[PDB]
Amino acid sequence: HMLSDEQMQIINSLVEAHHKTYDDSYSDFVRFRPPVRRLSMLPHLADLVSYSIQKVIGFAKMIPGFRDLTAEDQIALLKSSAIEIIMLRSNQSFSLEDMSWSCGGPDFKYCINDVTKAGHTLELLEPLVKFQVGLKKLKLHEEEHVLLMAICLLSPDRPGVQDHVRIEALQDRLCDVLQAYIRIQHPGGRLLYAKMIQKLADLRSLNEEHSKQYRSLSFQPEHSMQLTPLVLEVFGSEV
Amino acid sequence: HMLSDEQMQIINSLVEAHHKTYDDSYSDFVRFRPPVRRLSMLPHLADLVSYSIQKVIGFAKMIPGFRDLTAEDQIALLKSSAIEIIMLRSNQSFSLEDMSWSCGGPDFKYCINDVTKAGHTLELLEPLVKFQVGLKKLKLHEEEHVLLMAICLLSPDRPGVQDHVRIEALQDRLCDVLQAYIRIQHPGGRLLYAKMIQKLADLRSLNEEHSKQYRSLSFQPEHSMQLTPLVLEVFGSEV
């Protein structure tokens, strides 16, 4: 068959949102606390992550439907998915060659080593890199990649969610367009969709691992004082 | 007369503390969020101020007596005096020539203009600069300057203070050494002491002004999210 107007209107709506919240020049990175190669990277990455949360929020506010959800639900979804949207969006700059996140220039190229000095262990970094690679290999389309982020953020199976009905619908509406688009626009994507969901599944484990470690760091004020108000609030455990 | 051993032991104790918490190279400034000349300076100055709080604390922990006070009293004194210790210590880098704070190099030279873009108004900046100048003119000695900071931090007339007795004593013990030292070691300081106290008095007004403005900014999350955990905690109103 072929996508409909509605299905398409959504695709253009998401894609526009992403271009508007993801700067390809990375010119904002120069404004973060400088990277330093005892958690010497924590300041710079904290600022990177904080900055990213801001973008993920801006992206969400533009997803059709999300804005009509209750402020409470919006938060529930963000606080539980944000970390995953960041892992998904960071892939856009992940490079298989040097196995790293190459952003602005040389200063903003984060190796597996750099990332180590931010308070996280291989217990997370190993699977994370694994994830980035496997995903980078799916050579998804900008439309598929953008959808996947919207599907992950509109997962009703997140703690704190109230209207576990309306959201379930929205996600369903998104999941179709993806299955459709791939069927129609992505030659050789006969097995893509299924593969993309397995990725939304891996994101839960990463989410899990990061949360444990985040608590550990978060408890030591000499380390939490290095974070940002937004990072503390979103990754915090306040209800 | 002439200072005693005790009086002197304190002077060397304070002076050593200051040298240990005030880096003359300012090499740490490069690690702050870069300055940008809509509150473009807020990030860099927030980091400057946060960094300074850390130093003021380290300085306090080394003041003879302070460490024996109750953790509660230590906090009461810090939270209420910190902002003043920072205004006093910043004078060490204030330059009468260009009427600015010249720190590291050109990047870390803050004009009256720069400081405007951090969320503060002339309502505070005007008297502040006025203060810095009048004080810079007293050409105090490192021993007098260091004492003055210790006297200001050990002011018992601060909200939250419990042991309003023991502290009153410590401050008294400090105020003498200053009156003595000046009498003995500072030619032409016949009127200095009195002039220095008038400065501890001006610090209360500045403290006052800054607090009002800090609240204003602090209430707007788009601005508070730019601050640091330590700045929020110390300048916050938690009891």
Binding site: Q54, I57, A71, I75, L230, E233, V234, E238 | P221, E222
Partner: peptide
């Protein structure tokens, strides 16, 4: 009660 998240979510 999530000061920042709320502010960023409106506008």
């Amino acid at each position: 009660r999530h000061k920042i998240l709320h502010r960023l979510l409106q506008e």
